[PDB]
């Protein structure tokens, strides 16, 4: 509808796949080469489905900060025959707050879904499903099951992936450029 939705759509149409694990279907962001991200609660194993094709997992790393605290981001290298467009130059270098973000989801349940979530707070610490978690972004939208893995963008920046909600607020894990060197 406007330039925020324009940037979000450009990311969805080239840099997402539908990932299926034994824990469900997730929006999965491809970042560069065969490297993608997914919430750590997806419990990626040795095999994953990518757009309903059986795909070997070459590497999966559940990130933690240097306090050894959960970040809720898993970096997956896929045995896929095709590279992603390199979008690392759209990743923030530091923790920050943002204005006027969009959360974008693409699954079998929610295809072509875009949500203007407004202001994004650097929330920091969250007890996420009982797990202490750092580098959490918060937005005041009532997000629902099916949105985990959704991509959070502003114009020109890919800032996080949706990992949870409390019925009134939604929470994303930060993406930082330093995760993908």
């Amino acid at each position: 509808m406007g330039p925020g939705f324009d940037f979000a759509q450009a990311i969805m149409k080239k840099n997402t796949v539908i990932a299926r694990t034994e824990k469900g279907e997730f929006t999965m962001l491809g970042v560069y080469d065969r490297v993608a991200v997914i919430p750590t609660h997806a419990s990626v194993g040795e095999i994953i489905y990518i757009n309903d094709v059986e795909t070997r997992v070459l590497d999966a790393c559940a990130l933690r900060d240097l306090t050894d605290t959960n970040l809720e981001i898993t970096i997956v290298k896929l045995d896929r025959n095709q590279k992603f467009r390199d979008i690392r130059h759209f990743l923030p270098r530091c923790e920050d707050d943002y204005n006027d973000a969009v959360l974008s989801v693409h699954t079998s349940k929610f295809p072509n879904m875009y949500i203007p979530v407004g202001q994004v707070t650097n929330y920091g610490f969250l007890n996420l499903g009982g797990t202490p978690t750092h580098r959490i972004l918060m937005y005041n939208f009532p997000t629902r099951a099916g949105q985990c893995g959704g991509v959070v963008t502003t114009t020109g920046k890919v800032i996080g992936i949706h990992v949870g909600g409390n019925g009134a607020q939604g929470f994303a894990a930060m993406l930082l450029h330093s995760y993908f060197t």
Side-chain angles (χ1 to χ4, degrees), residues 3-176:
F5 292 107
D6 203 16
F7 182 80
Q9 181 178 258
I11 298 297
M12 296 309 289
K13 283 180 178 282
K14 288 290 166 176
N15 282 80
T16 65
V17 297
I18 302 178
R20 174 179 289 279
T21 74
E22 295 179 328
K23 313 256 162 110
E25 242 181 26
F26 297 86
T27 302
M28 167 174 268
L29 179 74
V31 180
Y32 73 106
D33 292 354
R34 297 167 291 167
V35 177
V37 292
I38 192 170
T40 298
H41 72 253
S43 302
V44 178
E46 295 292 346
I47 301 168
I48 191 164
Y49 273 49
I50 300 297
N51 298 333
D52 275 304
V53 179
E54 188 181 9
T55 305
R56 287 189 290 276
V57 174
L58 298 172
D59 188 50
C61 180
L63 302 179
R64 306 187 66 90
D65 73 11
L66 295 182
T67 76
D68 191 23
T69 307
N70 181 47
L71 291 167
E72 201 56 21
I73 300 286
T74 293
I75 305 180
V76 182
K77 194 164 171 184
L78 299 172
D79 199 3
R80 193 146 178 264
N81 71 355
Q82 181 177 175
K83 296 176 186 63
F84 300 115
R85 175 196 186 190
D86 188 345
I87 59 163
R88 290 180 284 185
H89 58 289
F90 302 138
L91 298 175
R93 269 134 182 277
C94 61
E95 307 181 17
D96 212 351
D97 316 280
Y98 297 90
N99 306 304
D100 189 29
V102 171
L103 169 63
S104 50
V105 167
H106 189 83
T107 66
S108 303
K109 185 178 194 187
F110 291 147
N112 298 305
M113 165 183 295
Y114 301 78
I115 306 163
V117 294
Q119 271 191 340
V120 180
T121 308
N122 177 2
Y123 192 90
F125 171 92
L126 183 68
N127 190 346
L128 179 67
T131 302
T133 306
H134 287 166
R135 287 186 178 148
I136 291 289
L137 300 167
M138 182 274 290
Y139 30 90
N140 284 295
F141 188 89
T143 58
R144 306 220 212 85
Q147 287 155 201
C148 288
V151 187
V152 190
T153 64
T154 64
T155 69
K157 294 172 260 44
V158 179
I159 69 171
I161 63 163
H162 187 76
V163 297
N166 59 25
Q169 309 173 307
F171 301 105
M174 289 176 191
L175 293 169
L176 298 178

